Amino acid sequence: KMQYFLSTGNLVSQSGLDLQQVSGYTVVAEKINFYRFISHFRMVHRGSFFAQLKTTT
Amino acid sequence: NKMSPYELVQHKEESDEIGGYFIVNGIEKLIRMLIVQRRNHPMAIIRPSFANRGASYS
Amino acid sequence: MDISKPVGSEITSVDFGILTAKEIRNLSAKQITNPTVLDHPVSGGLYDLALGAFLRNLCSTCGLDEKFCPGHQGHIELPVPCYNPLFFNQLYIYLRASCLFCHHFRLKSVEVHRYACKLRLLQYGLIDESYKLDEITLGSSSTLLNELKSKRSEYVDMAIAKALSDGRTTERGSFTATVNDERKKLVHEFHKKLLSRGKCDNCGMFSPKFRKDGFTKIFETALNEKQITNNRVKGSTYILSTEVKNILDTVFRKEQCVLQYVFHSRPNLSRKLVKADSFFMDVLVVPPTRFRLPSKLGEEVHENSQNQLLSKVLTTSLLIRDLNDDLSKLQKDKVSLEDRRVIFSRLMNAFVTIQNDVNAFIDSTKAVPIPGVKQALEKKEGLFRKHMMGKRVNYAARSVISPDPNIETNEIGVPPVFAVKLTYPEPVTAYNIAELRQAVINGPDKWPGATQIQNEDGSLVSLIGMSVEQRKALANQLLTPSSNVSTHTLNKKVYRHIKNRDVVLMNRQPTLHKASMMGHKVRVLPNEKTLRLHYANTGAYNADFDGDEMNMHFPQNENARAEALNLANTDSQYLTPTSGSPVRGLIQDHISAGVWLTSKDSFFTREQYQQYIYGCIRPEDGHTTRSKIVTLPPTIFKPYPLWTGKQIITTVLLNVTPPDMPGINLISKNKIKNEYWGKGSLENEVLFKDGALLCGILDKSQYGASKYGIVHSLHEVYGPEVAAKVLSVLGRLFTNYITATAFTCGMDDLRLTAEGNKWRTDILKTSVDTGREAAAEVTNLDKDTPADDPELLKRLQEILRDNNKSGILDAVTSSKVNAITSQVVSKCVPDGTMKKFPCNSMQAMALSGAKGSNVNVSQIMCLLGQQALEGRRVPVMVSGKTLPSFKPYETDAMAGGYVKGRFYSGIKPQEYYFHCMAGREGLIDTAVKTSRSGYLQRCLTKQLEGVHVSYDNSIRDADGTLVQFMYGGDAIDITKESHMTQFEFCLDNYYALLKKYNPSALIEHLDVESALKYSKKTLKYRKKHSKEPHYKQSVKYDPVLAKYNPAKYLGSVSENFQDKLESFLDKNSKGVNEKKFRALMQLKYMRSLINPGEAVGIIASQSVGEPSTQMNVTLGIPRLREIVMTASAAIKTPQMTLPIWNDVSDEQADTFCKSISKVLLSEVIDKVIVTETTGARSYVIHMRFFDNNEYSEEYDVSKEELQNVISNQFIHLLEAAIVKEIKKQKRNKVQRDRQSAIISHHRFITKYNFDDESGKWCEFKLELAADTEKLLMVNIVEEICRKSIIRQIPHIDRCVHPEPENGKRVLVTEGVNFQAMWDQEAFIDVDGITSNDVAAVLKTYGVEAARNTIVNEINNVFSRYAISVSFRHLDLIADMMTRQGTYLAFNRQGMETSTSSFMKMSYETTCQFLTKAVLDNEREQLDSPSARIVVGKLNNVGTGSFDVLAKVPNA
Amino acid sequence: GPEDFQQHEQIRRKTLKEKAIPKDQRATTPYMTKYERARILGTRALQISMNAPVFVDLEGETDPLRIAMKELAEKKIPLVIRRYLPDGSFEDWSVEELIVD
DNA sequence: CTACCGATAAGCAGATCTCTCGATTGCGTAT
DNA sequence: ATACGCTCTCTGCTTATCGGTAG
RNA sequence: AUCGAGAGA
Ligand SMILES: [Zn+2]
Ligand SMILES: [Zn+2]
């Protein structure tokens, strides 16, 4: 089940965490170059909720 | 966990291999950090959906 | 489409109908019984061999393989009829409002007959008759009603016979948009009248009601005890599908009379009875195996979703059939009822299950869910919008685009990788075998070659796997006489490669206008994998060369070749139809090269001059019209010959411009002033004379996309081809010049002098205190106050808390610091610069218009200025600090975002942070704006796709509905309107214009006297009149365009053109006389007319959509949405403008504004004190107002009016709120008389008073029962004070007096109420008031005032952003909107009244418009462009506006 | 049957004649529109590429559209433009009858 | 004295250029 | 052990219960 | 085939 979570990003929870989204929790660490790779580990995301929105504050 | 760069290149990985990612089906994956509310702090909130929740809700 | 296999038949029209159970049982190949698809196909299953061939199994119906089997339909027999999901709402509406006893509707029979007669009349174009039938009310009991019905029937018959005799309608009926609107309104009112009935009228037998719970389920309720009382004198439950079918069958077979007209929009010839069995599905038709083949993806085999749903239906059907046999055991045998009750409940559950299975097979929102057959045809991914309104195409290509200046401006560079794959069918002949045989010998690999050789009989042989000798043999046998008689009228084709003569169509998404898809000429280059495009097309395509890519479509027939080379080609689209401005030209390097070449400082020896001339112009390529290059005498004879760059321009024109014509006489300007060349220079004033550049420099304004430059003038005078050649020649010239004298920019260009730097420092030293001064001004504190004063800090804290005050402070500080920035830049550029123009390449680019602007130069070299975020300065945290570096409430320009730093010297960390804020905001805004305006274009174009120009010169919709009688009022093409009011230019170029127009061949085909005489009469009458208003004048003479065709009668011109021509000829008397010049200008007006067949609707939609992307009343896309996308009756900012009389002073206007604007009660309240005492629960609501000499002055409200409003409305609303809250919680003798009156009038007021001498307090005691709980009595009081008005005029929020712009003095009020301002004639010019609200002006002024308001508003959105859109587009839009007399919109709501339903169902809500089109048996004659492409027929607009006939020489 | 087809044909031809506008009263543009020119060139190119007899003399050219343009210059295109009015009425202008630009 | 037509609070249907890669139903059951 | 039955968007149209006016 | 991440203009 942990391998499924890491492979898909889906948060299959019978109870639900205190989080909003249910998918896209794991990104694939791309190896185009070391700059891309190192920046993979320094990024923090607001959430998939705000991608599909109109308010821009 | 504690291998020096010499041992790291001996074990075929890299000179300065860094961690923080998983390997699943030979494809490297990372659990992306997410931003969430500050813990253990009561923060006053104004939100229209609080009133939209029901009636007489401010 | 092979052109050697003509198709004789053609689909004239398609009419929607209902597939009955009898014909599908007749037409089907086999019935599908078991819900097993495979074991090999299951015999009797979904993949049965009778439904088509399947995986090498020959079809058992036609005996053909998978290639030659079209697929055949099968049917599954439903054990019980089922409610069709599409028609269930109509089934339910007809089930309700009916009598189960008498089997007629519960509406009066005479009223039903009246509706039937009106519908029979509306089936013909007889709207007036169907309304004059209403006035036959008897008139003129049962016998009387029968006679009345007979009278109405005979009246209808006589009216229809008269219409058929006099020609207004044929036997097929006349169905247009307005008759469709009338029919829809009548049917809607008929249904609404039916459903609003309680008791049957033919027999007063109450019928049980019905209830709805979605679908598949209909239940009836029993009558009440008092209701059955009438049922006792007239002498819940689950109803069944068969029961409701029988009920509606009886009702329909009784009321056929009205139903034949309710379910028809045109008369039915066969007179087929409308039956209720068409609303029920007792048989399901299964699509053929060809359309239900399995979705196989390698080893990932998946069953088709349609097969899944059909198998579920089959399982439920077989289960019901089995349940129908064991239930027979518990009915024939005398068994107990408990087991029988269980079996019957199971059967009912199975009925519901099969109904839901059918509803799942048809739809997926009624049954994650499997997509049914409705979802395949619903949305953007549906069948319509993804496979009929947009398709994948053969013979097309895509690649990255790279620039190329050594290719013609009308050409495209195609790599050999494309040039060998793309191919064109060229049929062999006796004049073509020279090259086609060579291509066949070349083969598929050696360009140019033939990949395939299509034989006469359609055989398509391939040369890819063939040897050279065999290819030579085939090419030798390529042109042979046909040995077969049946194929002796054909010639072999050759799929030869794409040569240089072939034409190609390019496109770069998003295609925001038609200019973004042009037909280029093919130039096969020798290097691969990139599409080479000239720099002239960058502006047209909005293309770039930083990774942009674009498609390359290759037409396959000579018809499309001619269409692309003549109509869609590149050089015929020099001018955009949006405003008539040019869109092609050179961009950056060529512009700077021309600025350097065409200066006085440029001299060239004889060899250099000749080399430049031959580099740009090449006679062997056809670039020269004289077959021999001709040069000029040098401008310097001694000491040695020297030419000039302007002489090179003159020689270029002399060699490309055709001979036997005069040279261009053009006087214009450029972008570079005369102070950038020194004292006394005149290089800003371009001057041509006989095609010789004698003064000025060529700039962006001359070659490029600029009106009235040399390239535009050459276009106008010599056609589009010469302008294209001039663009190509100037591109080659400025490329070869820039090679030998290259252009560069560097660090020294970005430097100031020591004096420039000292100027910048001295001015910027005055910016230290501007933020503090502005803050002191905003906070109403006297100047020279310290930046850390406690009162200033407190005021700044209040301003930080309040958003509006924060915005005010931001505006003031931004204004001051922008003034300082302007000081700095105007002082230090270009005086303080180190390297100066023209040596300074940075300023050369800025001034020349090649790249950048003075803003960019100033940011690089002087300072960055104020950083503006969302129209404000930088955001400030809750602590008053705008950044950790700055102390709280820092009154400094740098703190607020004023960057005193330049990109040459660098910016500090704080300014870097602020600039990153601004750049992020800009990136966000660009990302949003790139597609914020994408829905508007499609919403417009769906309805306007058919509006074209007819040969009557009247623009009218595809079906035939007339939108305008003359395009724009004058039928002037916008792309040809450019040089019509350029009378000086036309006079200067008179002889070349005469040569191009050739009135020698334009006399015997024109009438040149009648139109001129009529126009003279009309002009004389108008000159005599027109000193009187527009309503009082009698017309007596329509404009000449009305009577005489402008394209057939010389002199028939618009009133504005004629007025301008006469004013010109009268104001300047200047050797050619006024008569011939006037004749030439009138001929030019004749030749500048918009051609019949123009897609004016598409052009208008594109020209109002694409410029939108370039983007206290809503602006831009929101306002365009309010106006043209939804036509909202309630807009966000309703305003109406009020003209003022010239005798009203500004003081009186302001007083009128104050006395008209509304004032709430809360706007005179200081504070309210509620002294609640429970010692029976009372309240003492003391009200405190401002000083009288303050609130009376501010609002014009006095003590008497205040007391009146408090006594009448405020106390009443307070009592109402108190009692509502109480009910919610359960779950001087004059003053004495006033108090007693208020107490008696209101519920529980115990005391009352007022400051009758100062108007300062209003204290009244209130009392309540002790049993009531505690009330807030502050929140409700505040809400009531907000609600209650002191003095308001309905719908007016605020009237203000803006500064007089355009000279006129106007007032603007928030909210539209026309009839309320008609009463203030003493201050308002009541006949000049105009409003934003189109709906209000439509209601109180008429359709045409709404038309004018629509035009003015849809123009005001563009004109605020300095965007020019021709009024012809806006007039067409508004006349399409108000084409029914109402403020319609561009959406599905306003689309319903339309002849073609294919258009609407392709637009959206496909299911709804399909049911409506099948209930009415609508027959659309394939008129709209959408229907044509759905059925695959040649479009009507453009080249399809006519037909081509062949004049054979033998009878 | 045969008589039903005969009356159908008679009605069709009567409607056709009732829609045609005679040469003496057509009120359309004397010129040839750009769409008319483009379609006449395309159709003539199709015809000649389909082995039709040609009237102008070939100058060694082999592009059918170029040959059609040459014919249009020489006014040797044997085609008729049937301009359709909105109500179905049509005026039969001839290529030579029209003035190109 | 009740039937019929408005008239605002509530419910319900719907769109907003190209291209890569990665992942893919949970138990149950009768032998 | 295995095959097979199965929780934080914008509009505009349509429905419901309270107001009257009138035979 | 569907939903998730990302990329180009
Ligand atoms: Zn078949
Ligand atoms: Zn009845």
Coordinates of N, CA, C and O in Angstrom, one line a residue, chain C residues 3-4 426-429 431-432 435 489-491 493 501 557-559 561-563 565-567 950-953 956 973 1001-1002 1005-1006 1045 1047-1048 1083 1086-1087 1091-1095 1434 1438-1447, chain D residues 25-43 45-51 58 60-67 69 78-87 91-94 96-97 99 101:
Chain C
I3 N -11.2 13.5 -57.6 CA -12.0 14.2 -58.6 C -12.3 13.5 -59.8 O -13.0 14.0 -60.7
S4 N -11.9 12.2 -59.9 CA -12.2 11.4 -61.1 C -13.4 10.5 -60.8 O -13.7 9.6 -61.7
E426 N -1.4 15.1 -59.4 CA -1.3 15.8 -60.6 C -1.7 14.9 -61.8 O -0.9 14.0 -62.1
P427 N -2.9 15.0 -62.4 CA -3.2 14.0 -63.5 C -2.4 14.3 -64.7 O -2.2 15.4 -65.1
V428 N -1.9 13.2 -65.3 CA -1.1 13.3 -66.5 C -1.9 13.8 -67.6 O -3.1 13.6 -67.7
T429 N -1.2 14.4 -68.6 CA -1.9 14.9 -69.8 C -0.8 14.9 -70.9 O 0.2 14.2 -70.8
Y431 N 0.4 17.8 -72.0 CA 1.3 19.0 -71.8 C 2.0 18.9 -70.4 O 2.8 19.8 -70.1
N432 N 1.9 17.8 -69.7 CA 2.5 17.6 -68.4 C 3.5 16.5 -68.3 O 4.2 16.5 -67.3
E435 N 7.4 16.9 -67.0 CA 7.9 16.9 -65.7 C 7.4 15.7 -64.8 O 8.1 15.3 -63.9
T489 N -12.6 7.9 -70.2 CA -12.8 9.3 -69.9 C -11.9 9.8 -68.7 O -12.3 10.7 -68.0
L490 N -10.8 9.1 -68.5 CA -10.0 9.4 -67.3 C -8.5 9.4 -67.8 O -8.2 8.9 -68.8
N491 N -7.7 10.0 -66.9 CA -6.3 10.0 -67.1 C -5.6 9.6 -65.8 O -6.1 9.8 -64.7
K493 N -3.2 9.6 -62.6 CA -2.7 10.6 -61.7 C -1.3 10.3 -61.3 O -0.8 9.1 -61.4
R501 N 6.1 25.5 -57.4 CA 4.9 26.1 -57.9 C 3.7 25.9 -57.1 O 2.7 26.6 -57.1
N557 N -6.5 19.8 -54.5 CA -7.2 20.0 -55.7 C -7.0 21.5 -56.2 O -6.7 22.4 -55.4
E558 N -7.1 21.6 -57.5 CA -6.9 22.9 -58.1 C -7.8 24.0 -57.6 O -7.5 25.2 -57.6
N559 N -9.0 23.6 -57.2 CA -10.0 24.5 -56.6 C -9.4 25.2 -55.4 O -9.4 26.4 -55.2
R561 N -6.3 25.1 -54.6 CA -5.1 25.8 -55.0 C -5.4 27.3 -55.4 O -4.8 28.2 -54.9
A562 N -6.4 27.4 -56.2 CA -6.8 28.8 -56.7 C -7.4 29.6 -55.5 O -7.1 30.8 -55.4
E563 N -8.1 28.9 -54.6 CA -8.6 29.6 -53.4 C -7.4 30.2 -52.5 O -7.5 31.3 -52.0
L565 N -4.2 30.7 -53.5 CA -3.3 31.6 -54.2 C -3.9 32.9 -54.5 O -3.2 33.9 -54.8
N566 N -5.3 33.0 -54.5 CA -6.0 34.3 -54.8 C -6.7 34.9 -53.6 O -6.5 36.1 -53.4
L567 N -7.4 34.1 -52.8 CA -8.2 34.7 -51.8 C -7.5 34.6 -50.4 O -7.6 35.6 -49.7
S950 N -25.0 39.5 -49.5 CA -25.7 39.0 -50.6 C -25.5 39.9 -51.8 O -25.0 41.1 -51.7
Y951 N -25.9 39.4 -53.0 CA -25.8 40.2 -54.2 C -26.7 41.4 -54.2 O -26.6 42.3 -55.1
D952 N -27.7 41.5 -53.3 CA -28.5 42.7 -53.1 C -27.7 43.8 -52.4 O -28.3 44.9 -52.1
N953 N -26.5 43.5 -52.0 CA -25.6 44.4 -51.2 C -26.2 44.5 -49.8 O -25.9 45.5 -49.0
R956 N -27.2 39.4 -44.8 CA -28.3 38.6 -44.2 C -27.8 37.2 -43.9 O -26.8 36.7 -44.5
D973 N -15.7 48.3 -48.3 CA -14.8 47.3 -47.7 C -13.8 48.0 -46.8 O -13.3 49.1 -47.2
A1001 N -12.6 51.6 -69.7 CA -13.3 50.3 -69.7 C -14.4 50.3 -68.7 O -15.0 49.2 -68.5
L1002 N -14.7 51.4 -68.0 CA -15.7 51.5 -67.0 C -16.7 52.6 -67.3 O -17.1 53.4 -66.4
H1005 N -20.5 50.1 -69.0 CA -21.1 49.2 -68.1 C -21.7 49.9 -66.9 O -22.0 49.2 -65.9
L1006 N -21.7 51.2 -66.9 CA -22.2 52.0 -65.8 C -23.2 53.0 -66.2 O -23.2 53.5 -67.4
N1045 N -27.9 51.3 -56.8 CA -26.9 50.4 -56.4 C -25.5 51.0 -56.5 O -25.2 51.5 -57.6
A1047 N -22.7 49.8 -56.7 CA -21.7 49.1 -57.5 C -22.2 49.1 -59.0 O -21.5 48.4 -59.8
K1048 N -23.2 49.8 -59.4 CA -23.7 49.9 -60.7 C -24.0 51.3 -61.2 O -24.1 51.5 -62.4
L1083 N -15.4 57.1 -58.8 CA -15.0 55.7 -59.3 C -14.3 54.9 -58.3 O -14.5 53.7 -58.2
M1086 N -16.8 53.6 -56.0 CA -17.4 52.4 -56.6 C -16.6 51.2 -56.5 O -17.1 50.1 -56.3
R1087 N -15.2 51.3 -56.7 CA -14.3 50.2 -56.7 C -13.9 49.8 -55.3 O -13.3 48.7 -55.1
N1091 N -17.4 42.9 -51.6 CA -17.8 42.0 -52.6 C -19.0 41.2 -52.1 O -19.1 40.8 -50.9
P1092 N -19.9 40.8 -53.0 CA -21.0 39.8 -52.6 C -20.4 38.5 -52.3 O -19.6 37.9 -53.0
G1093 N -20.8 37.9 -51.1 CA -20.2 36.7 -50.6 C -19.2 36.8 -49.5 O -18.7 35.8 -49.1
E1094 N -19.0 38.0 -49.1 CA -18.0 38.3 -48.0 C -18.6 37.7 -46.7 O -19.8 37.8 -46.4
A1095 N -17.7 37.1 -45.9 CA -18.0 36.5 -44.6 C -18.0 37.6 -43.5 O -17.1 37.6 -42.7
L1434 N -20.7 21.7 -49.7 CA -20.0 23.0 -49.9 C -20.7 24.2 -49.2 O -21.9 24.3 -49.3
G1438 N -18.8 33.1 -49.4 CA -17.6 33.1 -50.2 C -17.8 32.6 -51.5 O -18.7 32.9 -52.2
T1439 N -16.9 31.6 -51.9 CA -16.9 31.1 -53.3 C -18.1 30.1 -53.5 O -18.3 29.7 -54.6
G1440 N -18.8 29.8 -52.4 CA -20.0 29.0 -52.6 C -21.3 29.8 -52.7 O -22.4 29.2 -52.7
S1441 N -21.2 31.1 -52.9 CA -22.4 32.0 -53.0 C -23.1 31.8 -54.3 O -24.1 32.4 -54.5
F1442 N -22.5 31.1 -55.3 CA -23.0 31.1 -56.6 C -22.8 29.7 -57.2 O -22.5 28.7 -56.4
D1443 N -23.1 29.5 -58.5 CA -22.8 28.2 -59.2 C -22.2 28.5 -60.5 O -22.2 29.6 -61.0
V1444 N -21.5 27.5 -61.0 CA -20.7 27.6 -62.2 C -21.4 26.7 -63.3 O -21.6 25.5 -63.0
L1445 N -21.7 27.3 -64.4 CA -22.3 26.6 -65.5 C -21.3 26.6 -66.7 O -20.6 27.5 -66.9
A1446 N -21.4 25.5 -67.5 CA -20.6 25.4 -68.7 C -21.4 25.6 -70.0 O -22.4 25.0 -70.2
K1447 N -20.9 26.5 -70.8 CA -21.6 26.8 -72.1 C -21.1 25.8 -73.2 O -20.2 26.0 -73.9
Chain D
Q25 N -33.0 42.6 -67.0 CA -33.3 43.3 -65.7 C -32.5 42.9 -64.5 O -32.9 43.1 -63.4
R26 N -31.3 42.3 -64.7 CA -30.5 41.9 -63.6 C -29.8 43.2 -63.0 O -29.3 44.1 -63.8
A27 N -29.8 43.2 -61.7 CA -29.3 44.4 -61.0 C -28.2 44.1 -60.0 O -28.0 44.6 -58.9
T28 N -27.3 43.2 -60.5 CA -26.1 42.8 -59.7 C -24.9 43.5 -60.3 O -25.0 44.3 -61.3
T29 N -23.7 43.4 -59.6 CA -22.5 44.1 -60.0 C -22.1 43.7 -61.4 O -22.1 42.5 -61.8
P30 N -21.7 44.6 -62.3 CA -21.2 44.2 -63.6 C -19.8 43.6 -63.5 O -19.5 42.8 -64.4
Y31 N -19.1 43.8 -62.4 CA -17.7 43.3 -62.3 C -17.8 41.8 -61.9 O -18.9 41.3 -61.5
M32 N -16.7 41.1 -61.9 CA -16.5 39.8 -61.4 C -15.9 39.9 -60.1 O -14.8 40.5 -59.9
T33 N -16.5 39.3 -59.1 CA -16.0 39.4 -57.7 C -14.8 38.5 -57.6 O -14.5 37.7 -58.4
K34 N -14.0 38.8 -56.5 CA -12.8 38.0 -56.3 C -13.1 36.5 -56.1 O -12.4 35.6 -56.6
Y35 N -14.2 36.2 -55.3 CA -14.7 34.8 -55.2 C -15.0 34.2 -56.5 O -14.7 33.0 -56.8
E36 N -15.7 34.9 -57.3 CA -16.1 34.4 -58.6 C -14.9 34.1 -59.5 O -14.8 33.1 -60.2
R37 N -13.9 35.1 -59.5 CA -12.7 34.9 -60.3 C -11.9 33.7 -59.8 O -11.5 32.8 -60.6
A38 N -11.8 33.5 -58.4 CA -11.0 32.4 -57.9 C -11.7 31.1 -58.2 O -11.0 30.1 -58.6
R39 N -13.0 31.0 -58.1 CA -13.7 29.7 -58.3 C -13.7 29.4 -59.8 O -13.7 28.3 -60.2
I40 N -13.9 30.4 -60.7 CA -13.8 30.2 -62.1 C -12.5 29.7 -62.6 O -12.3 28.8 -63.4
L41 N -11.4 30.3 -62.0 CA -10.1 29.8 -62.3 C -9.9 28.4 -61.8 O -9.3 27.5 -62.5
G42 N -10.3 28.1 -60.6 CA -10.2 26.7 -60.1 C -10.9 25.7 -60.9 O -10.4 24.6 -61.2
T43 N -12.2 26.0 -61.3 CA -13.0 25.1 -62.0 C -12.4 24.9 -63.4 O -12.4 23.8 -64.0
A45 N -9.3 25.3 -64.3 CA -8.1 24.5 -64.1 C -8.4 23.0 -63.9 O -7.8 22.1 -64.5
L46 N -9.4 22.7 -63.1 CA -9.9 21.3 -63.0 C -10.3 20.7 -64.3 O -9.9 19.6 -64.7
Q47 N -11.0 21.5 -65.1 CA -11.5 21.0 -66.4 C -10.4 20.7 -67.3 O -10.3 19.7 -68.0
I48 N -9.4 21.6 -67.4 CA -8.3 21.5 -68.4 C -7.4 20.3 -67.9 O -6.9 19.6 -68.7
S49 N -7.1 20.3 -66.6 CA -6.3 19.1 -66.1 C -7.1 17.8 -66.3 O -6.4 16.8 -66.2
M50 N -8.4 17.8 -66.5 CA -9.1 16.6 -66.8 C -9.2 16.5 -68.3 O -10.2 15.9 -68.8
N51 N -8.3 16.9 -69.1 CA -8.1 16.6 -70.5 C -9.2 17.3 -71.3 O -9.8 16.7 -72.3
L58 N -0.7 27.4 -75.7 CA 0.2 27.1 -74.6 C 1.6 27.6 -74.9 O 2.2 27.4 -76.0
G60 N 4.4 26.7 -73.4 CA 5.2 25.7 -72.7 C 4.8 25.6 -71.2 O 5.5 24.8 -70.5
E61 N 3.8 26.3 -70.7 CA 3.4 26.2 -69.4 C 2.7 24.9 -69.1 O 2.1 24.3 -70.0
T62 N 2.8 24.4 -67.9 CA 2.1 23.2 -67.5 C 1.3 23.3 -66.2 O 0.7 22.3 -65.8
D63 N 1.2 24.5 -65.6 CA 0.3 24.7 -64.4 C -1.1 25.0 -64.9 O -1.3 26.0 -65.6
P64 N -2.1 24.1 -64.6 CA -3.4 24.3 -65.0 C -4.0 25.6 -64.5 O -4.8 26.3 -65.3
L65 N -3.7 26.1 -63.3 CA -4.2 27.4 -62.8 C -3.6 28.5 -63.6 O -4.3 29.5 -63.9
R66 N -2.3 28.4 -64.0 CA -1.7 29.4 -64.9 C -2.4 29.5 -66.3 O -2.6 30.5 -66.8
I67 N -2.7 28.3 -66.8 CA -3.4 28.3 -68.1 C -4.8 28.9 -68.0 O -5.2 29.6 -68.9
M69 N -5.6 31.2 -65.8 CA -5.4 32.7 -65.8 C -5.1 33.3 -67.1 O -5.6 34.4 -67.4
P78 N -15.2 29.3 -71.2 CA -16.6 29.1 -71.5 C -17.4 28.7 -70.3 O -18.0 27.6 -70.2
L79 N -17.6 29.6 -69.3 CA -18.3 29.3 -68.1 C -19.3 30.5 -67.8 O -19.1 31.6 -68.3
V80 N -20.3 30.1 -67.0 CA -21.3 31.1 -66.6 C -21.4 31.1 -65.1 O -21.5 30.0 -64.5
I81 N -21.5 32.3 -64.5 CA -21.7 32.4 -63.1 C -23.2 32.6 -62.8 O -23.8 33.5 -63.4
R82 N -23.8 31.7 -62.0 CA -25.2 31.8 -61.7 C -25.3 32.4 -60.3 O -25.3 31.7 -59.3
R83 N -25.4 33.7 -60.2 CA -25.4 34.4 -58.9 C -26.8 34.2 -58.3 O -27.8 34.5 -58.9
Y84 N -26.8 33.6 -57.1 CA -28.1 33.3 -56.5 C -28.6 34.4 -55.5 O -27.8 34.8 -54.6
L85 N -29.8 34.9 -55.8 CA -30.4 35.8 -54.9 C -30.8 35.1 -53.6 O -31.0 33.8 -53.6
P86 N -31.1 35.8 -52.5 CA -31.4 35.1 -51.2 C -32.6 34.2 -51.3 O -32.7 33.2 -50.6
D87 N -33.6 34.6 -52.2 CA -34.9 33.8 -52.2 C -34.8 32.7 -53.3 O -35.8 32.0 -53.5
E91 N -29.3 35.0 -61.5 CA -29.0 35.7 -62.7 C -27.7 35.0 -63.3 O -26.7 34.9 -62.6
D92 N -27.8 34.7 -64.6 CA -26.8 34.0 -65.3 C -25.9 34.9 -66.0 O -26.1 35.3 -67.2
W93 N -24.8 35.4 -65.3 CA -23.8 36.2 -65.9 C -22.8 35.3 -66.6 O -22.5 34.3 -66.1
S94 N -22.2 35.8 -67.7 CA -21.2 35.1 -68.4 C -19.8 35.7 -68.1 O -19.7 36.9 -67.7
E96 N -17.2 36.4 -70.0 CA -16.9 37.5 -70.9 C -17.8 38.7 -70.6 O -17.3 39.8 -70.8
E97 N -19.0 38.4 -70.2 CA -19.9 39.5 -69.9 C -19.4 40.4 -68.8 O -19.6 41.6 -68.7
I99 N -16.6 42.2 -66.2 CA -15.4 43.0 -66.4 C -14.5 42.6 -65.2 O -14.9 42.9 -64.0
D101 N -11.9 43.2 -62.6 CA -11.3 44.4 -62.0 C -11.5 45.7 -62.8 O -10.6 46.1 -63.5

